[PDB]
């Protein structure tokens, strides 16, 4: 139609006019090229947008200016994210990195943890994905956002549990236990948080999971009336009987009782398994 | 001597564990000596160490009645003393105990 | 006496359903203005620093 041959045409145009202005050799040359990007925008050429647009701020750049060399540098990263995630990767670490030597820690924490999301959702890397999300937790915690730095410890708890080692689930369970009991309002759901890490204790040796259980029961006195615990004690019971159809049988009754998250039935299959 | 802190350990195999005796390394114990081994200020526990090959440098393995009975696990802390018997008053000259079925 | 009990109740839960339903997506609009008027003034403030510090560095060198 005429949008995309037009736009393309006058794109082409503002490019050109730029590379023979700079030639002569410059605002008007980052002003043309970022209305050519946008051209291309309105066109759905999200390839080669982003060049334009790093084009522009290496312009900007090279006259001091910092400042909106890094939010084009963002929107050009944006753009690359449908494109192509490393370009788009590389755009936002720079801006991470501008931003960083600025201050600006909260710009910084949202970067990584979009470059975090990008990197578990369209490649897959979760060790890389972790340690974007550790970095952001590490950011908020040094402003003091409680929630934002509870729900990145516990998103790297699961995935730790998921695929790595045991000790990072139990201690950041632990943690945020700690940290949301003694508040107010989470303290309805802080109960579950201490469960997962006992469970995450069945996975080394039931003696471990028994004194966790234990050492939770005696912190928490509203953990021992808690059907949760009932349950992990059952289940104690069904292992140390070496008895796979006590086990079944409880985590039938139970997911009757409630349905299941589908991480807790695969921690449990896991535990099961190795009931021997 | 003055005692040294170290990790319990899994028994390795069921005769040593039928034997009641904590399984040591070679280079750390030897066969016949005996031990106090502390998990608190007011858990002081006695032992009798047997060596094993299977133990590593610095850890002593326990069988699971021994865990049961001195509440020892697998992961924690404790430390073990050498500890000598008084065999002039702390001779056994009758001991009795009691016997149950282990399996119903 | 059933009947009019039963469908009481499951008139009342269907209604806070639906409202829930409605009010939590207008929440999430919501949450979606304030994060795009966040970044607008925080980018309004930055410019405004910018331009006052040229502002002050012309000035002096002027004077």
């Avoid at chain 1, 992990?232 to 019971?237: A, D, G, R």
């Avoid at chain 2, 590593?56 to 021994?66: D, E």
């Amino acid at each position: 139609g005429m949008d995309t041959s037009g736009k393309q045409a006058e794109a082409m145009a503002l490019l050109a006019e730029a590379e023979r202005k700079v030639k002569n050799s410059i605002e008007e040359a980052c002003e043309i090229y970022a209305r050519a990007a946008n051209m291309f925008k309105m066109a759905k050429n999200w390839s080669a947008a982003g060049n334009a647009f790093c084009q522009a701020a290496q312009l900007h750049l090279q006259l001091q200016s910092k400042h909106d060399a890094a939010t084009c540098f963002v929107d050009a990263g944006n753009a690359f994210k449908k494109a192509d995630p490393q370009e788009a990767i590389n755009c936002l670490m720079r801006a991470i990195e501008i931003y960083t030597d600025m201050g600006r820690f909260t710009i910084a924490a949202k970067h990584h943890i979009s470059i975090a999301e990008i990197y578990e959702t369209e490649l897959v890397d979760v060790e890389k994905a972790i340690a974007h999300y550790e970095q952001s937790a590490d950011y908020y915690k040094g402003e003091e956002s409680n929630s934002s730095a509870n729900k990145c410890l516990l998103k790297v708890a699961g995935y730790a549990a998921q695929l790595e080692q045991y000790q990072k689930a139990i201690d950041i369970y632990e943690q945020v236990g700690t940290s949301a009991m003694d508040s107010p309002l989470l303290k309805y759901s802080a109960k579950d948080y201490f469960f997962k890490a006992a469970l995450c204790h069945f996975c080394i040796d039931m003696l471990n999971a028994k004194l966790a259980v234990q050492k939770y029961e005696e912190l928490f006195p509203a953990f021992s009336d808690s059907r949760e615990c009932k349950l992990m004690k059952k289940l104690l019971e069904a292992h140390e009987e070496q008895n796979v159809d006590s086990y079944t049988e409880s985590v039938k009754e139970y997911d009757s009782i409630s349905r299941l998250d589908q991480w807790l039935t695969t921690m449990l299959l896991r535990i099961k398994k190795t009931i021997q | 001597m003055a005692g040294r802190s170290m990790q319990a350990a899994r028994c390795p195999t069921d005769e040593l564990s039928l034997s009641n005796c904590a399984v040591v390394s070679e280079k750390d114990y030897q066969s016949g000596q005996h031990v106090i081994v502390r998990t608190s200020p007011n858990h002081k526990y006695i032992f009798t160490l047997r060596t094993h090959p299977s133990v590593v440098p610095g850890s002593v393995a326990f069988s699971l009645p021994q865990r049961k009975w001195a509440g020892l696990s697998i992961g924690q802390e404790i430390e073990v003393a050498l500890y000598s018997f008084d065999k002039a008053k702390q001779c056994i000259g009758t001991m009795t105990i009691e016997i149950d079925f282990l399996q119903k | 006496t059933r009947h009019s009990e039963i469908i009481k109740l499951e008139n009342s839960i269907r209604e806070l359903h639906d409202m829930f339903m409605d009010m939590a997506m207008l929440v999430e609009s919501q949450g979606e203005m304030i994060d795009r008027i966040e970044y607008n003034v925080e980018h309004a403030v930055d410019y405004v620093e910018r331009a006052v510090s040229d502002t002050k560095k012309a000035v002096k060198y002027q004077s």
